Amino acid sequence: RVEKAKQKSAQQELKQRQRAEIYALNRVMTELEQQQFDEFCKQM
Amino acid sequence: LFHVNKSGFPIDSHTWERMWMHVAKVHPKGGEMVGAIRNAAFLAKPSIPQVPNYRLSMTIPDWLQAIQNYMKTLQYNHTGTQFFEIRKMRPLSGLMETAKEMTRESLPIKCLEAVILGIYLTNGQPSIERFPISFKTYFSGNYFHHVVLGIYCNGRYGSLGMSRRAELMDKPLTFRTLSDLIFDFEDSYKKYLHTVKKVKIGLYVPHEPHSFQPIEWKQLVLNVSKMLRADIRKELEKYARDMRMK
Ligand SMILES: *[C@@H](C(=O)N[C@@H](Cc1ccc(O)cc1)C(=O)O)[C@@H](O)C(=O)OCC
């Protein structure tokens, strides 16, 4: 109903927070791999 | 090396803590990078991509593009922890349950996960034939294994997949022969300064919902280090002809 949509469960909130952390981490690790790739392309 | 989540979901504490311990080592900024994420008061919630749904106004190439776009939006997984365990000799029906879990969790994936997800999302179109294509390559002192999902339909070859490199995954359904597809991958690898060591072609993957046979990954294996391109072509074309005769 109205009330249930206002506030997710602790479990739902944790799952969403972990997914946000996974994507924040994937962004920085993708950038790091892209930098190392970009660097190597110029060093050849 | 990379870790695999062998705890399923919810991810257990050991697997979660190990994920962060690993990236603190790999990333130059170490614990500073990790703390900036783990201790953030607020993190942006990534949009959840909709699972592709076929519509009558799609051609087969359109549908393959929708599927590939979904996998691209999940993103290639550079976290160092593969989130979905794929035992590639498991019965297909069990791998399809894992593909369903990928669509529910909506997390980054790597190449093998993308093959399984690509099978799942094309099971509803029996005119699309799917078969794994594997490469062992050498780059900068180390060896790398990679798999993509080969596609055959109406006299053309293409592929679906995921890779950290843009040219090692999806290929349009415009290759007139299997060899032309394989050599496009080889030329892509060579532009990335990889050397191809082995090519493996699997069997067509059944579409039926509860198939209990494993995927066959290496019906044809080519060790290409001392093979001429003309001889690689002859073997691939003989094998492709056998695929199409059933
Ligand atoms: C298979 C996979 O993701 N393969 C990698 C292969 C690769 C390509 C290019 C470079 O430079 C390095 C490695 C990919 O396509 O990104 C996947 O399931 C896996 O985990 O393999 C580990 C290499």
Q: Where are the domains of chain B?
A: 1-246
Helices (H), B75-225: 92-105, 111-122, 178-191
A and B: number of Cβ contacts within 8 A? 59
First to last CA, chain B: 39
B148 phi, psi to nearest 5 deg: -130, 170
The residues near B196 (Cβ < 8 Å, ≥ 6 apart) are: B135, B136, B137, B185, B186, B189, B190, B224
Task: Please name the residue of chain A whose CA is at the shortest distance from the CA of residue B38.
Answer: A21
Nearest one of B165, B118, B76 to A29, comparing CA atoms: B76
CA B171 to chain centroid: 12
Question: Is the CB of B44 less than 8 angstroms away from the CB of A33?
Answer: no
In one letter, which amino acid is B118?
Answer: G
Contact B44, B123 (CB under 8 A): no
3-state SS class at A25: helix
**Paired residues of B220 in beta bridges:** B201
In terms of phi and psi (left: phi > 0; alpha: psi -120 to 50; beta: otherwise), the region of B84 is: beta
3-state SS class at B15: helix
Question: Is the CB of B23 less than 8 angstroms away from the CB of A25?
Answer: yes
Question: Is the CB of A26 less than 8 angstroms away from the CB of B26?
Answer: no
The rounded distance, in Å, linking the Cα atoms of B166 and B196 is 17
The rounded distance, in Å, linking the Cα atoms of B220 and B233 is 13
Residues 5 through 34 of chain A touching chain B, CB cutoff 8 Å = 15-26, 28-30, 32-33
